[PDB]
């Protein structure tokens, strides 16, 4: 969780339909938006883990 939380800072992390898991490329990777990465943080680290 520590490094995962640190992952989402530069790494996409956007979970591809749960099964494929977090996206491993950078945030900017595809059309995976800020919301898309947000969705993951709030999922993994907490409902109130909306980091910028
Ligand atoms: Zn991505």
Structural contact between residues 24 and 15, judged by C-beta atoms closer than 8 angstroms: no
Separation of CA 6 and ligand 1 centre (Å)? 16
Domain count across the chain = 1
Separation of CA 29 and ligand 1 centre (Å)? 5
Alpha carbon distance, N-terminus to C-terminus of the chain? 17
Could you tell me which of 44, 51, 50 has the C-alpha nearest to residue 23?
A: 44
Q: Which domain holds residue 43?
A: 1-52
- Dihedral sign from CA coordinates of 16, 20, 21, 24: negative
Separation of CA 48 and ligand 1 centre (Å)? 23
Tokens standing for residue 18: 């749960």
* Residue spans of alpha helices (H) in 1-52: 2-7, 34-44
Separation of CA 5 and ligand 1 centre (Å)? 16
Separation of CA 10 and ligand 1 centre (Å)? 11
Q: Please name every residue paired with 26 in a beta bridge, in sequence order, or none if there are none.
A: 11
Q: Return the CATH number at 49.
A: 6.10.140.1270
Q: Going by C-beta distance under 8 Å and a sequence separation of 6 or more, which residues neighbour residue 24? A: 11, 12
- Return phi, psi of residue 40, to 5°: -80, -45
Structural contact between residues 50 and 38, judged by C-beta atoms closer than 8 angstroms: yes
Structural contact between residues 41 and 8, judged by C-beta atoms closer than 8 angstroms: yes
Taken as a whole, the chain contains a residue count of: 52
């Amino acid at each position: 969780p520590e490094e995962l939380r640190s992952l989402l800072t530069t790494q996409c992390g956007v979970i591809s339909e749960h099964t494929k898991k977090m996206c491993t490329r950078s945030l900017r990777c595809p059309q995976h938006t800020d919301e898309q990465r947000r969705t993951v943080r709030v999922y993994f680290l907490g409902p109130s883990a909306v980091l910028p």
